[PDB]
Amino acid sequence: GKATDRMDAFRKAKNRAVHHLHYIERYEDHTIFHDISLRFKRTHIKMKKQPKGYGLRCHRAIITICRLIGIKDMYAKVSGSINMLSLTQGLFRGLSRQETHQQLADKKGLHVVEIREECGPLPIVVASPRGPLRKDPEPEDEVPDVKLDWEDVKTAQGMKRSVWSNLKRAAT
């Protein structure tokens, strides 16, 4: 919203946002369906899925948007240019292009089974295809040709030292 007086700019932006609403899909109504990693212009956003109770550990703006959407638990790291307008335009972009468990099953005609450490080896079926279930399995891949992120690999190997990560903060 733009205007000369600040009270007039709040109205234009507020009344015009309800006409450009998105719908964000949520996994169990508390987090996203999968890890997201995109780049809107120069701003990188790498969101991760987390279980219940993890809370929101992300940029303060993302904390304020997520509460509006209804996402209680998720981690996000912003890199590149911290521009509030590219950060916001990219957040809504990746949260709308995320594939749910039902679309995935229908796409490949296979069962989507959830494996949890708390529930042991019990296979939990979260989604199944509505159409004909395929009889052949996916070809097991010896080594996957997937691009990795040095930041995540460096943390899993106990090498990312930082006196600012995993700090005790207030509830979000």
Partner RNA sequence: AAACUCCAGUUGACACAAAAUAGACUACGAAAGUGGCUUUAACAUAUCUGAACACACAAUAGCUAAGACCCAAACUGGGAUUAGAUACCCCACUAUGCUUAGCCCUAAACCUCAACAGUUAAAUCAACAAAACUGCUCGCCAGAACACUACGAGCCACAGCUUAAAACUCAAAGGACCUGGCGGUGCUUCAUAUCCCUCUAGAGGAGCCUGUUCUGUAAUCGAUAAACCCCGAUCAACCUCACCACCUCUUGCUCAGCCUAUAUACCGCCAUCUUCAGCAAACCCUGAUGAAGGCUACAAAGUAAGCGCAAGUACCCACGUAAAGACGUUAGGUCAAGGUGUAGCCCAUGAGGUGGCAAGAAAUGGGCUACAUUUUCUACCCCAGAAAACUACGAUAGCCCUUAUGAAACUUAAGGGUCGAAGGUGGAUUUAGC
Partner RNA sequence: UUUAAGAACGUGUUUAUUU
Give residues in contact with RNA (CB under 7 A): 2-4, 6, 8, 11-12, 15-17, 19-20, 39-42, 85, 89
Cβ 72 to RNA shortest distance, Å: 24
Cβ 52 to RNA shortest distance, Å: 30
Beta bridge partners of 37: 46
- Whole-angstrom Cα distance, residue 35 to residue 76? 10
- Whole-angstrom Cα distance, residue 78 to residue 88? 11
**Lookup: tokens for 85:** 């307008």
Identity of the residue numbered 102: Q
Among candidate residues 46, 30, 49, the one with its CA nearest the CA of residue 38: 46
Cβ 107 to RNA shortest distance, Å: 15
CB closer to RNA out of 84 and 119: 84
CB closer to RNA out of 30 and 39: 39
Q: Between vectors from CA 154 to CA 151 and to CA 159, what angle results, nearest 5°?
A: 130
**Lookup: tokens for 30:** 């508390």
Cβ 108 to RNA shortest distance, Å: 18
Cβ 65 to RNA shortest distance, Å: 12
CA 172, 156, 125, 92: dihedral to nearest 10 degrees?
Answer: 50
CA-CA-CA-CA torsion sign (52, 151, 57, 127) = negative
CB closer to RNA out of 12 and 107: 12
CB closer to RNA out of 88 and 128: 88
CB closer to RNA out of 4 and 162: 4
